[PDB]
Amino acid sequence: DGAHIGNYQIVKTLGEGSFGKVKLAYHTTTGQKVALKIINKKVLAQGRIEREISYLRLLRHPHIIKLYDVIKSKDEIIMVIEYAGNELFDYIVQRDKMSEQEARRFFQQIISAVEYCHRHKIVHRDLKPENLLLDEHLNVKIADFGSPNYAAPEVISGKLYAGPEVDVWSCGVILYVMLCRRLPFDDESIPVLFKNISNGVYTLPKFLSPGAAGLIKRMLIVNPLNRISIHEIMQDDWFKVDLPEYLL
């Protein structure tokens, strides 16, 4: 409880909860900021935590949150996660509308990460800002593994199945939001909202470039079968523009 911990110097507890207790800290020699997610016996009331860890361990990507260490005992499971002090959410809200160039930059980074997940047979299923962190060089970091609005028709239901086509849908809502600073389906009326989603009822503003209009249009297809795939996205002309080498 302990202002230090084998390489890591505790600073202060960011938040608290059931098992929760989440403190911030940093590498003694490297200086890297880190969150320590603490867990224990409470967890008796488990499967999703092993999921997290195995998942985060398996995924080494510039745009997926890093798991530096998992420290176990007969009580505690302490996770040593990479720190990012902001969300993409905040960045969106606090500035007004962002240039096509800017959203392609973040977008490329998100899609990159997602394509990596899928390659390793893992689908996110809850993509959204607030699951999309930002570091200090303004880099997206997927964080998870709050809003019904980025959730695909197959997720909002629970009769059909949620495949990788589903992160694509999310990612299309995320694009549209960065681009329009308005949610494609947002409604005060819960039913009207889900109706809209399941019917893919939304407006493409006319101010959208033909390239972005086009790519969003193909991401928000109700029928997973006609929905664009991750691979097909990476070969979109609008998407390729200024697409960094490393993201290949």
What is the set of domains in the chain, with CATH numbers?
1-83 (3.30.200.20), 84-248 (1.10.510.10)
Token pair in block for residue 85: 């002090």
Is 14 labelled as part of a ligand binding site? yes
> Helix or strand or coil: residue 240?
helix
Dist CA 20 CA 23 (whole Å): 10
In angstroms, rounded to a whole number, what is the distance separating the alpha carbons of residues 82 and 65? 6
From which experimental method does this structure derive?
X-ray
What is d(CA 74, CA 243) in angstroms, rounded to the nearest whole number?
A: 47
CA 234 to chain centre: 18
Of the residues 90, 126, 135, 187, which is catalytic? 126
> Is 110 exposed, middle or buried (CB count within 10 Å of its CB: 0-12, 13-18, 19+)?
buried
Q: Is 21 flagged in the annotation as binding?
A: yes
Q: Is residue 47 a known part of a binding site?
A: no
22 is in an annotated binding site: yes
First to last CA, the chain: 43
Which of 53, 87, 92, 52 is closest to 70 using CA atoms?
53
- 37 annotated among ligand-binding-site residues: yes
CA distance 90 to 8: 28
Q: What is the resolution of this structure in A?
A: 2.9
The answer to whether 25 and 36 are in contact (CB under 8 A) is: yes
CA-to-CA distance for 170 and 109, rounded, in angstroms? 14
Helix axes 165-180, 210-219, angle to 10 degrees: 140
Q: Is 126 a catalytic residue?
A: yes
Residue closest to 183 by CA, chosen among 214, 147, 219, 213? 147
**Two tokens, residue 227:** 């929905």
